[PDB]
DNA sequence: ACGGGTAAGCAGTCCGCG
DNA sequence: GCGGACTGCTTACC
């Protein structure tokens with residue numbers, strides 16, 4: 025037996041015992057109960073010397089505890105006295121650290137990941153899990169070990185009796201009277217019909233004991249499915265039987281009970297719930313107009329809506345065959361989405377790295393508390409007691425005020441992982457604080473005028489001095505996560521570059537039948553592959569393109585989420601629930617960044633005045649925290665439309681000017697700033713990102729800024745990737761906002777593409793056609809979106825109260841128009857909503873209306889709102905005002921002037 | 927309780943203004 | 945009868 029080391033699955037604390045589920049050395053799943061004996065520490069005199077020193081070198085003495093409750097009355101007793109009680113007071117983590125004293129290398133094929141969704145017919149409307157009034161009438165449950173979809177289908181219920189489900193009919197196309205259940209899963213569905221609900225649940229509980237999930241997921245499974253099936257079994261069989269959903273027989277019900285409802289969260293000891301919706305909100309870097317599975321599915325996977333007739337509420341009685349097919353597809357849908365985004369994998373990686381419960385990957389603070397503590401166990405150090413602190417504003421990034429205008433030629437540069445780098449460069453840590461110095465005003469450091477803070481320590485322009493010689497835990501531990509990011513980024517950019525090869529190739533689609541190639545898209549297509557691609561068919565290239573984008577999304581996920589974590593350690597230092605919170609360090613970081621950016625603004629202005637020849641002229645037109653945006657018009661003039669054959673030539677050129685002259689200069693400038701602050705290590709690595717301009721010989725303006733955080737740019741090269749066709753990089757404007765209607769986002773963007781690529785005549789032409797045709801766009805397409813908070817607070821007898829938002833006012837008028845009948849869907853406090861304006865003297869008695877997003881409005885009122893919609897207002901408010909924004913800034917009109925020729 | 931600050935633009939109210 | 949300054953709210957950007 026020359027083989028693998030054990031690895032935990034879950035862990036819990038009940039009283040004076042730890043409940044752990046793990047995978048042993050022969051790969052079998054197990055449970056133990058352990059009366060863990062923890063150790064906390066206390067200071068002692070300089071003399072009682074030993075192993076343990078706090079992070080400041082103050083000696084400490086370790087204390088046996090008999091059990092965990094015994095060590096907790098000690099932490100309370102030490103506060104009753106008023107001395108610091110050191111050590112890790114979350115014992116699940118100490119236990120994990122004690123048991124798994126090594127880099128955990130873990131096998132996912134051995135971890136049970138279950139994915140489920142239920143269906144619960146209600147003619148009452150939305151079925152609150154806290155009550156669970158209504159029968160659970162279908163469950164689908166996918167198990168990653170077995171690799172099967174277990175279907176529990178209830179044929180008999182007070183809401184209707186139905187025929188068994190046919191897997192043959194599910195397989196067939198929609199077009200053949202079937203449900204289009206993906207055939208790569210037909211062979212994996214185990215189907216189980218049932219007499220009656222009781223019999224189905226009892227069988228589901230027995231199924232769960234045999235195949236108890238470790239990671240439990242699915243869509244919206246924390247706030248609906250789990251608590252509904254808990255409360256349901258609890259109402260029908262009793263708590264005892266309900267507690268079966270826990271492998272340890274412990275649940276918690278914490279009440280948190282709306283402004284008037286009964287929403288509880290239910291925790292199942294010994295299971296790690298990773299609600300995919302929470303994973304998606306945290307790790308996907310999107311902001312969506314709706315978070316229904318239909319919606320997100322169609323966004324991530326480009327699959328269809330998933331249609332049907334009648335309202336979902338009467339669906340099981342009318343087409344039970346589809347009701348079940350749809351439940352199965354929903355579960356698979358989440359799998360399809362996880363196969364793209366890979367957030368489960370992320371979570372496992374991250375979680376086993378820190379040695380935490382996996383559901384603690386939602387908490388950067390947990391995540392770092394544990395990494396840091398593991399890193400300090402190692403050197404026999406003892407961690408601080410966490411302290412109460414009052415909350416406190418403090419300053420962040422600098423942002424240059426730009427002159428609103430157009431900018432023909434732009435070229436950007438940005439610093440690598442800024443704040444993480446600053447920590448590394450400066451050696452910022454709880455335990456590396458040397459002292460302070462007398463701080464001169466910020467600009468004196470920017471202008472390289474103020475006295476050198478210190479000769480011996482590493483400094484930040486907020487007055488902090490750090491030990492330059494030793495190693496900080498934080499810097500150390502952030503360097504390890506940064507190095508993993510570097511690598512996954514590499515794969516992702518490669519993947520992106522490889523995709524542009526493929527897109528170029530798609531104007532030579534070679535009339536032929538082939539299969540796609542066999543390459544590893546994380547690495548730069550070696551020349552022989554590149555030559556092979558030039559001969560392939562569309563069918564084939566297209567399959568490679570799609571495979572590349574899945575490889576790149578994979579890498580994006582891994583990369584941007586380590587960026588998230590490290591930037592989140594920075595954040596934690598400004599958050600009072602973090603054991604190492606310190607505004608001294610938070611501000612050392614932001615203030616140094618303020619300086620860094622401004623310092624290099626001054627520099628880049630200097631160098632480009634020297635070499636361009638001119639003097640005291642603005643070359644940096646904008647910048648945000650780590651960014652600079654340099655006007656390259658004068659670098660181009662220096663040649664002209666002389667020997668530039670095509671759009672690519674000057675792009676080749678600039679790429680070359682930046683890489684061969686500017687980044688050398690920039691490195692010189694920052695090396696000098698590091699000498700000034702006497703930092704530990706030079707890590708201000710500013711390289712080039714974007715390269716933007718009109719196509720050659722165009723009327724296109726290349727770029728514009730309206731104000732801070734609001735610009736567009738027509739970009740030909742980004743971080744080394746040369747685009748096949750130019751890509752708009754729009755930051756801040758209305759095209760990028762989830763609040764603005766899809767159709768206008770589309771339109772506003774095509775307008776921008778025209779301003780930037782095909783001057784003023786192109787815009788005005790297209791604008792004319794948007795104005796005429798705008799009125800027959802589908803209403804869902806031209807509605808606004810808003811989050812819906814504090815509805816209750818602005819109610820006041822069915823009507824708008826003092827200071828009531830337009831969108832909240834919208835819901836109130838919905839609530840008035842569906843008043844009475846429970847048939848129609850309710851707007852949920854906190855969710856999102858569509859929003860249309862209404863004309864003068866409409867039947868709804870108000871100037872707009874709102875319904876919950878991702879849906880068609882109720883049929884009840886649909887035909888009325890469609891005919892009372894105010895397109896006039898729609899277009900002025902959401903298209904025109906924004907457009908005037910963009911064109912004012914860039915010195916342009918969208919409508920032909922009063923010619924004076926006339 | 928459970929990463930951070932910065933900043934834009936929309937709408938509502940309350941006030942000055944022949 | 946309406947514009948601007950202030951404020952609450954939403955959603956972007958690092």
Ligand SMILES: Nc1ccn([C@H]2C[C@H](O)[C@@H](COP(=O)(O)OP(=O)(O)OP(=O)(O)O)O2)c(=O)n1
Nearest residue numbers: 438439440441442443444587591649650930958
């Ligand atoms: N959610 C975020 C995003 C950014 N930032 C801060 C920390 C970043 O270091 C700094 C610069 O932002 P960037 O968006 O340019 O990201 P980075 O510089 O960290 O990494 P990179 O540009 O290599 O992707 O802004 C942050 O604190 N939190």
Ligand SMILES: [Ca+2]
Nearest residue numbers: 438439441650
């Ligand atoms: Ca950066």
Ligand SMILES: [Ca+2]
Nearest residue numbers: 438439650651
């Ligand atoms: Ca940046």
Ligand SMILES: [Ca+2]
Nearest residue numbers: 438712713743
């Ligand atoms: Ca970069």
